Design a protein around this ligand. Structure first.
Ligand SMILES: [Fe+2]
Ligand SMILES: [Fe+2]
Lengths: 127, 127
């Protein structure tokens, strides 16, 4: 038996800005447009479907975390540095300009254009 | 890049109520308590990390969709029926008590205790 998470919606101020930011940074294909969504496809058969928030007022920041290889971490963190992207070792953003070494891996937090708390890491939690 | 979505937070009024509801209904392992989260583990190397969100007034409904086998659909839909769980064929909840046939599969929508728009399906979109 195998119940998979296939997609989840992330509400943002500008779906194209957030989805393209994430695809460019993570080195993924250009988001595909599907109805009101900018669809960001991840490798494990799941997508983040970015959608413009049509309520009021501020976005409540969510959290998405991405598991990547060591080689991918080097390239993606390289884009964080080269692009001047704010980043932090910790989820509460008190440790700017550092990465963490949780689980003997590497991890770092950054935000999408709407302020969601994004995270990349090379080892799963507790591994 | 082979970037995986590893976890995402879902904000709810009661993390234990929502995670237990989803795990019971979908036939998943009992949610694990990790820090402030009730962690719902899916098969494709991703978890939904339910977290208490008790400010604001109402939860702004999100959307998570789960890809399952035909046999799992039969079992999960049987639990939807047995539990008296409200369900709809469509994302806008205009078609109560129907299953949809999108992509030649089967799909249905229902809500968690906090009003998030949950979806189960037997085929990926466009397949
Ligand atoms: Fe995280
Ligand atoms: Fe959906």
């Amino acid at each position: 038996m195998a119940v998979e998470l296939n997609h989840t919606i992330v509400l943002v101020k500008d779906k194209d800005a957030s989805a393209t930011f994430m695809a460019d940074l993570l080195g993924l294909p250009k988001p595909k447009e599907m109805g009101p969504f900018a669809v960001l496809q991840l490798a494990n058969d799941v997508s983040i479907d970015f959608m413009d928030f049509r309520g009021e007022g501020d976005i409540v920041p969510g959290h998405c975390a991405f598991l990547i290889s060591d080689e991918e971490f080097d390239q993606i963190f390289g884009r964080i540095r080269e692009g001047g992207i704010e980043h932090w070792a910790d989820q509460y953003h008190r440790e700017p300009g550092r990465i963490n070494d949780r689980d003997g891996g590497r991890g770092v937090y950054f935000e999408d254009p709407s302020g969601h708390n994004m995270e990349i890491m090379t080892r799963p939690y507790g591994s």
